[PDB]
Design a protein around this motif. Sequence first.
Motif, mmCIF file in Angstrom:
data_model
loop_
_atom_site.group_PDB
_atom_site.id
_atom_site.type_symbol
_atom_site.label_atom_id
_atom_site.label_comp_id
_atom_site.label_asym_id
_atom_site.label_seq_id
_atom_site.Cartn_x
_atom_site.Cartn_y
_atom_site.Cartn_z
ATOM 1 N N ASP A 1 0.846 -1.181 0.000
ATOM 2 C CA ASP A 1 0.000 0.000 0.000
ATOM 3 C C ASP A 1 0.887 1.239 0.000
ATOM 4 O OD1 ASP A 1 -1.761 2.052 0.374
ATOM 5 O OD2 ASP A 1 -2.790 1.241 2.064
ATOM 6 N N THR A 2 1.146 1.769 -1.192
ATOM 7 C CA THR A 2 2.018 2.931 -1.332
ATOM 8 C C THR A 2 1.409 4.244 -0.823
ATOM 9 O OG1 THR A 2 1.388 3.364 -3.647
ATOM 10 C CG2 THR A 2 3.202 1.832 -3.280
ATOM 11 N N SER A 3 0.119 4.239 -0.481
ATOM 12 C CA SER A 3 -0.491 5.422 0.119
ATOM 13 C C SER A 3 0.006 5.677 1.539
ATOM 14 C CB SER A 3 -2.022 5.327 0.130
ATOM 15 O OG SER A 3 -2.533 4.512 1.168
ATOM 16 N N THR A 4 0.569 4.647 2.173
ATOM 17 C CA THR A 4 0.922 4.715 3.598
ATOM 18 C C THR A 4 2.413 4.716 3.890
ATOM 19 O OG1 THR A 4 0.788 2.277 3.853
ATOM 20 C CG2 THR A 4 -1.207 3.514 4.252
ATOM 21 N N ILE A 5 2.771 5.360 4.999
ATOM 22 C CA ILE A 5 4.035 5.078 5.657
ATOM 23 C C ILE A 5 3.907 3.620 6.122
ATOM 24 C CG2 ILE A 5 5.606 5.705 7.527
ATOM 25 C CD1 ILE A 5 4.058 8.441 7.652
ATOM 26 N N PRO A 6 4.844 2.751 5.766
ATOM 27 C CA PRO A 6 4.681 1.322 6.044
ATOM 28 C C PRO A 6 4.293 0.979 7.486
ATOM 29 C CG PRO A 6 6.540 1.617 4.600
ATOM 30 C CD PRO A 6 6.064 3.007 4.971
ATOM 31 N N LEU A 7 3.157 0.295 7.601
ATOM 32 C CA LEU A 7 2.567 -0.195 8.847
ATOM 33 C C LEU A 7 2.049 0.862 9.813
ATOM 34 C CD1 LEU A 7 4.867 -3.229 9.722
ATOM 35 C CD2 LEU A 7 3.025 -3.074 8.071
ATOM 36 N N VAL A 8 2.897 1.824 10.160
ATOM 37 C CA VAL A 8 2.628 2.773 11.235
ATOM 38 C C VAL A 8 1.697 3.944 10.874
ATOM 39 C CG1 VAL A 8 4.802 2.216 12.407
ATOM 40 C CG2 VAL A 8 4.727 4.093 10.726
ATOM 41 N N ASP A 9 1.361 4.080 9.595
ATOM 42 C CA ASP A 9 0.552 5.196 9.139
ATOM 43 C C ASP A 9 -0.771 5.247 9.906
ATOM 44 O OD1 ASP A 9 -1.199 6.889 7.439
ATOM 45 O OD2 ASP A 9 0.463 6.838 6.068
ATOM 46 N N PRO A 10 -1.113 6.380 10.509
ATOM 47 C CA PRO A 10 -2.370 6.450 11.266
ATOM 48 C C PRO A 10 -3.636 6.196 10.440
ATOM 49 C CG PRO A 10 -0.881 8.196 11.893
ATOM 50 C CD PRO A 10 -0.323 7.622 10.611
ATOM 51 N N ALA A 11 -3.538 6.299 9.118
ATOM 52 C CA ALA A 11 -4.658 5.965 8.259
ATOM 53 C C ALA A 11 -5.046 4.500 8.387
ATOM 54 C CB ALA A 11 -4.350 6.300 6.798
ATOM 55 N N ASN A 12 -4.084 3.632 8.697
ATOM 56 C CA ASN A 12 -4.400 2.225 8.950
ATOM 57 C C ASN A 12 -5.280 2.038 10.194
ATOM 58 O OD1 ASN A 12 -1.087 1.049 7.847
ATOM 59 N ND2 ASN A 12 -3.025 1.169 6.702
ATOM 60 N N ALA A 13 -5.140 2.951 11.164
ATOM 61 C CA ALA A 13 -5.892 2.927 12.428
ATOM 62 C C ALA A 13 -7.230 3.622 12.376
ATOM 63 C CB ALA A 13 -5.036 3.580 13.536
ATOM 64 N N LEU A 14 -7.275 4.784 11.733
ATOM 65 C CA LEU A 14 -8.420 5.676 11.837
ATOM 66 C C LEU A 14 -9.360 5.619 10.632
ATOM 67 C CD1 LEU A 14 -6.722 8.760 13.402
ATOM 68 C CD2 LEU A 14 -8.429 7.334 14.474
ATOM 69 N N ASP A 15 -9.046 4.782 9.638
ATOM 70 C CA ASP A 15 -9.924 4.579 8.481
ATOM 71 C C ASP A 15 -9.928 3.095 8.208
ATOM 72 O OD1 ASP A 15 -11.119 4.294 6.030
ATOM 73 O OD2 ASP A 15 -9.979 5.887 5.022
ATOM 74 N N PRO A 16 -11.000 2.386 8.570
ATOM 75 C CA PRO A 16 -11.041 0.926 8.402
ATOM 76 C C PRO A 16 -10.953 0.478 6.940
ATOM 77 C CG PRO A 16 -13.210 1.733 9.016
ATOM 78 C CD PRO A 16 -12.247 2.879 9.187
ATOM 79 N N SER A 17 -11.283 1.359 5.994
ATOM 80 C CA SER A 17 -11.166 0.995 4.581
ATOM 81 C C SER A 17 -9.713 0.885 4.087
ATOM 82 C CB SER A 17 -11.986 1.952 3.687
ATOM 83 O OG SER A 17 -11.420 3.247 3.641
ATOM 84 N N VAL B 1 -9.865 10.821 5.807
ATOM 85 C CA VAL B 1 -8.614 10.187 6.212
ATOM 86 C C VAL B 1 -7.960 9.523 4.998
ATOM 87 C CG1 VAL B 1 -7.578 8.412 7.635
ATOM 88 C CG2 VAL B 1 -9.467 9.795 8.530
ATOM 89 N N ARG B 2 -6.686 9.818 4.797
ATOM 90 C CA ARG B 2 -5.883 9.200 3.756
ATOM 91 C C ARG B 2 -4.471 8.984 4.275
ATOM 92 N NH1 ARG B 2 -6.306 14.725 2.170
ATOM 93 N NH2 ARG B 2 -4.232 15.688 1.943
ATOM 94 N N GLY B 3 -3.775 8.045 3.662
ATOM 95 C CA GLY B 3 -2.377 7.786 3.983
ATOM 96 C C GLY B 3 -1.499 8.996 3.718
ATOM 97 N N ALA B 4 -0.337 9.011 4.355
ATOM 98 C CA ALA B 4 0.577 10.148 4.302
ATOM 99 C C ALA B 4 1.102 10.463 2.905
ATOM 100 C CB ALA B 4 1.748 9.910 5.222
ATOM 101 N N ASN B 5 1.141 9.450 2.035
ATOM 102 C CA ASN B 5 1.650 9.609 0.680
ATOM 103 C C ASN B 5 0.567 9.926 -0.351
ATOM 104 O OD1 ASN B 5 4.289 9.036 1.609
ATOM 105 N ND2 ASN B 5 3.778 6.824 1.545
#
Length: 320
Positions: free
Chosen positions: A228-244, A296-300
Motif C-alpha cells: 500500500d504505497t499510500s501509507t508510511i509502512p505499517l505505522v501510518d495512522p490511516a491504517n488505524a483511523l480509516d477501516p477501509s 482520512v488518507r495515507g501520508a503519501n
Amino acid sequence: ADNYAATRYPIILVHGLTGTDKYAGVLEYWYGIQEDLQQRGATVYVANLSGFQSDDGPNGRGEQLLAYVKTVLAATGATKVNLVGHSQGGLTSRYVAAVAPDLVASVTTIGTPHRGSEFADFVQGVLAYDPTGLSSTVIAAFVNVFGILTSSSNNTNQDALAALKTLTTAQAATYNQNYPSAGLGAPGSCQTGAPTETVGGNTHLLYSWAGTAIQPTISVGGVTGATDTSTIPLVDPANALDPSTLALFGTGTVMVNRGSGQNDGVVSKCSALYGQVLSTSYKWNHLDEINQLLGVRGANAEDPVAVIRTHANRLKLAGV
Ligand SMILES: [Ca+2]
C-alpha cells in the motif's frame, strides 16, 4: 471564495456501488466535495441513485440518472451537464452520454471499472461454490436491505445480484459492446481511446483518473504480495483511523493474485482508463478518491478534494 471552479454547465457528481448522496441522510458519499466546489463558485448537484442496480434497464441507474439530469436542467435553466462519476457512477455517466448526448457536455470517470473488477469476479465465483444457491438468496436480501436502509430516500429499488454481475469483467465487456465509446481503447489493450466524442452532433469532453495505491511488489512461489504505497509502512495512522485502508489492501491483494496489476483495492489501472487519462499515479485506494472515510488518507496520498477542484477549473478553461 472565488470562481475557480465555476463552469458553464452544472456539475453532477455520480456515486457508485452501495452509494446514495448521503448514507442514512448523515454521511456524504462525496465527503466535503460539494461544499468545496460550491465555495469555489461551482454549480454542483449530487445524484441519489440505487446503490445496487445495473446501469442499463428501465429501472437501472442510467435511466434514474437521465431523469435526474432533466430535473437539474429544469432547475438551473442550463442545457447540458458535466457528469463526474466515481466507480460504477462512471458507467452510469457513460450511459447518459450515449442515450442523451444532447444533454451532456463532458464525462469524467474516477476509479471506474470500465472493464469490470477482478474482485467482483471473485465474489461472484465464491457464490457458485454453494450448490444449493441459498448463499446468493440470503446475501442478496441482506445487501438489498442495507441499500434501502442507507439510501437517503430509502429507495426500495435495490438489486444486489444484478449490481455484482454488472461489475464482473465478462459483463463489463458486454456493456462496452452495448454502449461503445470513442473514449475506450480495444478490449484487452490496457489502453484508452480519444479525448472527445461527437455523438449525434454533440461533442463531449472525456476524462479519467485512477488510484494505484495497491502495487504488486513481490512474487514468491506463485503468490503475489502487494504494498500500500499510500501509507508510511505499517505505522501510518490511516491504517488505524480509516477501516477501509486495510480492507482495500486486503481486496487489492486478492486483485493482484487474479492478475489485475496495480489497483486501488477494487479497480485496476487498466480497467479505469477512459478518455483523456489525466493520471493513474495517485497513491490512492478506492475510497481515497472520494475523500473517504471522513477525509482520512495515507501520508503519501494526494489531496482528492484539490484534485477534483482543479478538474472543475480544467472544465471551465475547456469551455464547459
Ligand atoms: Ca482513506
